[PDB]
Design a protein around this ligand. Structure first.
Ligand SMILES: Cn1c(C#N)ccc1-c1ccc2c(c1)C(C)(C)OC(=S)N2
Ligand SMILES: Cn1c(C#N)ccc1-c1ccc2c(c1)C(C)(C)OC(=S)N2
Lengths: 251, 251
């Protein structure tokens, strides 16, 4: 009723529940956990591709641009969605990767990658502190898809600029749904966009761990499915080397 | 008598000629050329480790630090040695990888590989311009070995620093063999140490190209030998991610 139409459209095209297909009747091993995380990843990737086809504005960018944005942003979209699920289903106090892959802190501690779990866990904790709304989350998730471009820019740079600006304007409207008053709503825009800026650094730790694990995947018995392997091979070294342009809302 | 004894020692421990074992017989492909450079890189890795065992001071660092410095500097030493040979044998006008692997423009077909070679070519071009002497080159090449350290520094940090100052003093002596005046001498030291600073950015492009290729090796039909492979897997992602401290002579 009071919800802006683009936001209702964003809510309508959100994915259904995605399962990891993890055993759970067997004790965790570093290899089985990471394999399920990658299987979950492959499924989430498929879901991003489907979502992106319905995302207003996106289909009108050159196909190369679309592929590039998905390849740059997949880890940040996954970790943001994890943040949201963990916030909404478990009050932020477990990592809700999937309904069949939920790690409470004890399961994190016994994982082999406790510190990485803790890094990821920061996000749901920030959602709790900021009380991020569904409408703000939906807009912020679009901006993450649009949050890095090549050094040379995109083929459809003009159209990207219009689309990114439109979702920023939409995030502003989502904030205005609750944050009444110029000073509160102004501060809120700072905080939410600052959070997105801060994700670049958090995602860099995930990127490095993921790349090392991919390079060592045979030794470590971690499987990487096809689309996951393709995105990692295409872009992660270049992203880690800073040979792309992360977009920031603040200096 | 005129040549400082340490520089004489550096001349004497310099590696013998290294062949790539390249098949000039058959026409070259991009994959077969990259394979040959990786084979040359394997052979050069062994020569670097042998060289370092006779390099005054080096064997006195903690063994972990020795391994770290070689693994950090492998690419830079290889490209610096390439600049020296191209300068010496072909007036800087071809890339003299080995006596059986010399590339000119016509042999750099793929634009990606050609751009990479243009990057490497800057070094012999500068050697030709500055008329770098063997004595300068030999001191500079030790400082390259010593030109990046871990973020937490080395185990033998004190010894490393003394060793680095020693070779900086030896470079000054090298410059004094020819650059007679105090002003000329200081400006020459600036130029040579700026060239070393500038190698970090240059080598970063080689590191990224190398990691991408390693990641896609099976698909590109490019062979990476065992020792090279370990160096790339152990350090390149971390180096590219900026998780080391490059040392700079100038701000
Ligand atoms: C699946 N997922 C979500 C979700 N949901 C958030 C982050 C990730 C995700 C997916 C795959 C990987 C990783 C995280 C990490 C553990 C860094 O390392 C490797 S090797 N693969
Ligand atoms: C062998 N070598 C010299 C010499 N001499 C200088 C630089 C290199 C050297 C060695 C191996 C590789 C590379 C350069 C590049 C082309 C970057 O990419 C790949 S995939 N491997």
């Amino acid at each position: 009723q009071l919800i802006p139409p683009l936001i209702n459209l964003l809510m309508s095209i959100e994915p259904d529940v995605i399962y990891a297909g993890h055993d759970n009747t067997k004790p965790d091993t570093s290899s089985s956990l990471l394999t399920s995380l990658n299987q979950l990843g492959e499924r989430q990737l498929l879901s991003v591709v489907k979502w992106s086809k319905s995302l207003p504005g996106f289909r009108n960018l050159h196909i190369d641009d679309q592929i590039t944005l998905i390849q740059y942003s997949w880890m940040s979209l996954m970790v943001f969605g994890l943040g949201w699920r963990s916030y909404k289903h478990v009050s932020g106090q477990m990592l809700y990767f999937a309904p069949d892959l939920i790690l409470n802190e004890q399961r994190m501690k016994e994982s082999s990658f406790y510190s990485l779990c803790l890094t990821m866990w920061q996000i749901p904790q920030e959602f709790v502190k900021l009380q991020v709304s569904q409408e703000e989350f939906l807009c912020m998730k679009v901006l993450l898809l649009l949050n890095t471009i090549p050094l040379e820019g995109l083929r459809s740079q003009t159209q990207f600029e219009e689309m990114r600006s439109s979702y920023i304007r939409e995030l502003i409207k989502a904030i205005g749904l609750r944050q009444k008053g110029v000073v509160s709503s102004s501060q809120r825009f700072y905080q939410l966009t600052k959070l997105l800026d801060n994700l670049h650094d958090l995602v860099k730790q995930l990127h490095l761990y993921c790349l090392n694990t991919f390079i060592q995947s045979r030794a470590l018995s971690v499987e990487f499915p096809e689309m996951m392997s393709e995105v990692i091979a295409a872009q992660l070294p270049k992203i880690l080397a800073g040979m792309v342009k992360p977009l920031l809302f603040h200096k």
